[PDB]
Design a protein around this motif. Sequence first.
Motif, PDB file in Angstrom:
ATOM      1  N   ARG A  80       0.820  -1.207   0.000  1.00  0.00           N
ATOM      2  CA  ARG A  80       0.000   0.000   0.000  1.00  0.00           C
ATOM      3  C   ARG A  80       0.857   1.261   0.000  1.00  0.00           C
ATOM      4  O   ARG A  80       0.481   2.266  -0.612  1.00  0.00           O
ATOM      5  CB  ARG A  80      -0.937  -0.011   1.213  1.00  0.00           C
ATOM      6  CG  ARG A  80      -1.718   1.279   1.448  1.00  0.00           C
ATOM      7  CD  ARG A  80      -2.720   1.554   0.356  1.00  0.00           C
ATOM      8  NE  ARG A  80      -3.115   2.958   0.333  1.00  0.00           N
ATOM      9  CZ  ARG A  80      -3.847   3.506  -0.630  1.00  0.00           C
ATOM     10  NH1 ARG A  80      -4.276   2.763  -1.638  1.00  0.00           N
ATOM     11  NH2 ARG A  80      -4.163   4.789  -0.582  1.00  0.00           N
ATOM     12  N   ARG A  81       2.032   1.209   0.631  1.00  0.00           N
ATOM     13  CA  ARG A  81       2.928   2.360   0.643  1.00  0.00           C
ATOM     14  C   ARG A  81       3.494   2.658  -0.745  1.00  0.00           C
ATOM     15  O   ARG A  81       3.549   3.815  -1.167  1.00  0.00           O
ATOM     16  CB  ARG A  81       4.036   2.126   1.668  1.00  0.00           C
ATOM     17  CG  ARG A  81       5.097   3.200   1.733  1.00  0.00           C
ATOM     18  CD  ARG A  81       6.121   2.856   2.796  1.00  0.00           C
ATOM     19  NE  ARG A  81       7.322   3.674   2.692  1.00  0.00           N
ATOM     20  CZ  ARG A  81       8.481   3.367   3.263  1.00  0.00           C
ATOM     21  NH1 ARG A  81       8.596   2.259   3.981  1.00  0.00           N
ATOM     22  NH2 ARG A  81       9.525   4.168   3.117  1.00  0.00           N
ATOM     23  N   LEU A  82       3.953   1.633  -1.463  1.00  0.00           N
ATOM     24  CA  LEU A  82       4.416   1.870  -2.827  1.00  0.00           C
ATOM     25  C   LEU A  82       3.282   2.317  -3.740  1.00  0.00           C
ATOM     26  O   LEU A  82       3.484   3.168  -4.617  1.00  0.00           O
ATOM     27  CB  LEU A  82       5.109   0.627  -3.394  1.00  0.00           C
ATOM     28  CG  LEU A  82       4.441  -0.751  -3.455  1.00  0.00           C
ATOM     29  CD1 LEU A  82       3.617  -0.951  -4.721  1.00  0.00           C
ATOM     30  CD2 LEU A  82       5.479  -1.853  -3.332  1.00  0.00           C
ATOM     31  N   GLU A  83       2.077   1.770  -3.543  1.00  0.00           N
ATOM     32  CA  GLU A  83       0.931   2.205  -4.337  1.00  0.00           C
ATOM     33  C   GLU A  83       0.588   3.676  -4.084  1.00  0.00           C
ATOM     34  O   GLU A  83       0.327   4.431  -5.033  1.00  0.00           O
ATOM     35  CB  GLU A  83      -0.241   1.269  -4.037  1.00  0.00           C
ATOM     36  CG  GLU A  83      -1.427   1.350  -4.972  1.00  0.00           C
ATOM     37  CD  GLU A  83      -2.477   2.327  -4.527  1.00  0.00           C
ATOM     38  OE1 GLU A  83      -2.747   2.410  -3.315  1.00  0.00           O
ATOM     39  OE2 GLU A  83      -3.068   2.978  -5.403  1.00  0.00           O
ATOM     40  N   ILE A  84       0.605   4.111  -2.819  1.00  0.00           N
ATOM     41  CA  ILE A  84       0.342   5.519  -2.517  1.00  0.00           C
ATOM     42  C   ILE A  84       1.458   6.397  -3.072  1.00  0.00           C
ATOM     43  O   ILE A  84       1.208   7.515  -3.526  1.00  0.00           O
ATOM     44  CB  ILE A  84       0.074   5.783  -1.019  1.00  0.00           C
ATOM     45  CG1 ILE A  84      -0.249   7.259  -0.816  1.00  0.00           C
ATOM     46  CG2 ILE A  84       1.223   5.464  -0.139  1.00  0.00           C
ATOM     47  CD1 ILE A  84      -0.671   7.617   0.547  1.00  0.00           C
ATOM     48  N   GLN A  87       0.752   6.899  -6.651  1.00  0.00           N
ATOM     49  CA  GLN A  87      -0.365   7.831  -6.817  1.00  0.00           C
ATOM     50  C   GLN A  87       0.021   9.272  -6.500  1.00  0.00           C
ATOM     51  O   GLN A  87      -0.430  10.196  -7.179  1.00  0.00           O
ATOM     52  CB  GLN A  87      -1.575   7.407  -5.986  1.00  0.00           C
ATOM     53  CG  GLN A  87      -2.240   6.121  -6.456  1.00  0.00           C
ATOM     54  CD  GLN A  87      -3.567   5.857  -5.766  1.00  0.00           C
ATOM     55  OE1 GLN A  87      -3.980   6.591  -4.876  1.00  0.00           O
ATOM     56  NE2 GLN A  87      -4.248   4.802  -6.191  1.00  0.00           N
ATOM     57  N   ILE A  88       0.836   9.492  -5.466  1.00  0.00           N
ATOM     58  CA  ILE A  88       1.268  10.852  -5.140  1.00  0.00           C
ATOM     59  C   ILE A  88       2.175  11.404  -6.234  1.00  0.00           C
ATOM     60  O   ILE A  88       2.086  12.588  -6.579  1.00  0.00           O
ATOM     61  CB  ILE A  88       1.890  10.952  -3.728  1.00  0.00           C
ATOM     62  CG1 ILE A  88       2.122  12.419  -3.354  1.00  0.00           C
ATOM     63  CG2 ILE A  88       3.196  10.231  -3.593  1.00  0.00           C
ATOM     64  CD1 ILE A  88       0.890  13.292  -3.479  1.00  0.00           C
ATOM     65  N   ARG A  89       3.094  10.586  -6.764  1.00  0.00           N
ATOM     66  CA  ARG A  89       3.970  11.083  -7.820  1.00  0.00           C
ATOM     67  C   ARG A  89       3.165  11.429  -9.068  1.00  0.00           C
ATOM     68  O   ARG A  89       3.425  12.454  -9.719  1.00  0.00           O
ATOM     69  CB  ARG A  89       5.040  10.043  -8.127  1.00  0.00           C
ATOM     70  CG  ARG A  89       6.148  10.523  -9.028  1.00  0.00           C
ATOM     71  CD  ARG A  89       7.259   9.489  -9.091  1.00  0.00           C
ATOM     72  NE  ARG A  89       6.735   8.131  -9.200  1.00  0.00           N
ATOM     73  CZ  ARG A  89       6.934   7.178  -8.297  1.00  0.00           C
ATOM     74  NH1 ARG A  89       7.649   7.428  -7.210  1.00  0.00           N
ATOM     75  NH2 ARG A  89       6.417   5.971  -8.483  1.00  0.00           N
ATOM     76  N   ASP A  90       2.065  10.707  -9.292  1.00  0.00           N
ATOM     77  CA  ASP A  90       1.200  11.030 -10.419  1.00  0.00           C
ATOM     78  C   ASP A  90       0.368  12.266 -10.112  1.00  0.00           C
ATOM     79  O   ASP A  90       0.080  13.055 -11.015  1.00  0.00           O
ATOM     80  CB  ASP A  90       0.307   9.846 -10.775  1.00  0.00           C
ATOM     81  CG  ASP A  90       1.101   8.605 -11.125  1.00  0.00           C
ATOM     82  OD1 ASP A  90       2.346   8.675 -11.101  1.00  0.00           O
ATOM     83  OD2 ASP A  90       0.484   7.564 -11.434  1.00  0.00           O
TER      84      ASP A  90
END
Length: 90
Positions: A80-84, A87-90
């Motif tokens: 979930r941390r890598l997924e967030i 998403q934040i970098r996008d």
Amino acid sequence: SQIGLFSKICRVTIKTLHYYNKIGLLVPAYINPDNGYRFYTSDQLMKFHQIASLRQLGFTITEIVTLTQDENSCHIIERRRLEIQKQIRD
DNA sequence: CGCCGCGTCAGACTCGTAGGAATCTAAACCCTCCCCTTAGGGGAGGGTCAAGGC
């Protein structure tokens, strides 16, 4: 405590408790077999506290239904941390 | 028109368990319609729980 009083305790909707009892996370302590009334206890307040703590971290509900009983699952938090992070970098 | 051989049609026992029959066979497109996905919200319809009022 009936579903309205418990929903007033947690400051949450009755529909949220209905949905939760449906999916199996946070099933109430006593379901009245005559009229179907859902009664709750402070042990459900303690389960809902961590449910809301994970929900506030972005975990989907079906991730929570695995995360709160298979407590040793740890890959789903760096996941979930890598997924967030993506998403934040996008 | 009368008769003879030919074409055709219709019939032919009741108990247990096994017990059927088994081949052959477009593809690439497009469409509409229906259900599905979060995490619950909103409402309709129908019941239920303590308060009392007579």
